[PDB]
């Protein structure tokens, strides 16, 4: 069952890939929205070891964990309910399918351009089965002013 609400002031998301500019814009949007916590809890990048990337919370310095594996990110952050998939057209399908195995993820945002229609169709079928709302691929994402921002939606600050 797809919920009628997707984003709130307590929504936590996991970003797939090195998109430090997008995540920094997300954090700036959260700060100017008077959010208690940043909307990005962790990043997933398979081509590097687990570490902490340095980001800005307003003027303060914070560290956001980066995990080589998605399973570690879902394990250590059970409060995350949104995935923002920055994988390319060759990796968006597999990343989304692997994320769908985790029941904590309720909304998946796919940014990639050029995903084959069959693969997106399969993703739609599995999302309908699992009750996961997918912000369809080839999108910038979405904005909920005061609550949450997806990727680079809304431009710069």
């Amino acid at each position: 069952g797809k919920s009628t609400t997707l984003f709130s002031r307590h929504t936590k998301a996991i970003v797939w890939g090195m998109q430090t500019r997008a995540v920094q814009g997300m954090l700036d949007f959260d700060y100017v929205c008077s959010r208690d916590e940043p909307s990005v809890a962790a990043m997933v990048y398979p081509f590097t070891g687990d570490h902490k990337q340095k980001f800005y919370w307003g003027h303060k310095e914070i560290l956001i964990p980066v995990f080589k594996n998605m399973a570690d990110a879902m394990r250590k952050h059970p409060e995350v309910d949104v995935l923002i998939n920055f994988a390319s057209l060759r990796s968006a399908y597999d990343s989304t399918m692997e994320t769908m195995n985790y029941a904590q993820i309720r909304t998946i945002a796919i940014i990639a351009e050029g995903i084959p229609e069959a693969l997106t169709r399969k993703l739609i079928k599995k999302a309908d089965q699992k009750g996961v709302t997918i912000i369809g691929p080839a999108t910038v994402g979405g904005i909920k002013p005061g609550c949450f921002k997806i990727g680079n939606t809304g431009g710069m600050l």
Binding site: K54, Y56, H59, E61
Partner: protein
């Protein structure tokens, strides 16, 4: 001026957590230097503060000092001391000679400490009995790191292994890996 007014952001390119040079007092991983000397720390305590950021007990600091004492020198025949002497006889520098000597510290010379530690830690965590560990390392073909001397065999130990071992029995609370290594 802009930073003082809080007008701009610039991410810091570095990150340190061992020493705080700025401020009124020098700080070693949270402990001021005056508190360092009042607590009667030694080289071991300062080493623990700078390397582990921990307030080690007195016996731990004394054991670290003893380890530094026993590894101070082992003669000029080793590779590092040889290189240091070669660079010194060239009349180069203290720093350069020390550097040339220290650059030989690696797998074959000086790396037996870390290699033995990793070897015995892996063997202990694997849960295999010491006899099984010895048989496995015989069959696989790697020498057991930290085992084997040239001339001092029995009734005449290294005699600086004895000092550290006696200290560890006397002061260390629990020594499971030491007992495993002694069984090996």
């Amino acid at each position: 001026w802009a930073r003082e007014l809080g007008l701009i952001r610039k991410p810091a390119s570095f990150m340190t957590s061992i020493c705080d040079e700025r401020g009124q007092e020098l700080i070693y991983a949270g402990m001021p230097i005056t508190e360092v000397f009042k607590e009667e720390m030694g080289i071991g305590g300062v080493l623990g503060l700078l390397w582990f950021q921990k307030r080690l007990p007195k016996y731990s600091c004394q054991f670290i000092e003893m380890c530094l004492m026993v590894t101070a020198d082992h003669g000029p025949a080793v590779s590092g001391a040889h290189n240091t002497i070669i660079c010194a006889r060239a009349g180069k520098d203290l720093v350069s000679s020390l550097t040339s000597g220290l650059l030989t510290i690696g797998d074959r010379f000086g790396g037996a400490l870390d290699a033995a530690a990793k070897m015995f830690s892996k063997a202990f965590d694997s849960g295999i009995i010491p006899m099984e560990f010895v048989n496995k390392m015989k069959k696989e073909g790697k020498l057991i790191m930290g085992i084997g001397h040239r001339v001092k065999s029995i009734n005449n130990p290294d005699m600086r292994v004895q000092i550290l071992k006696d200290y560890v029995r006397q002061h260390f609370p629990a020594t499971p890996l030491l007992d495993y290594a002694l069984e090996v």
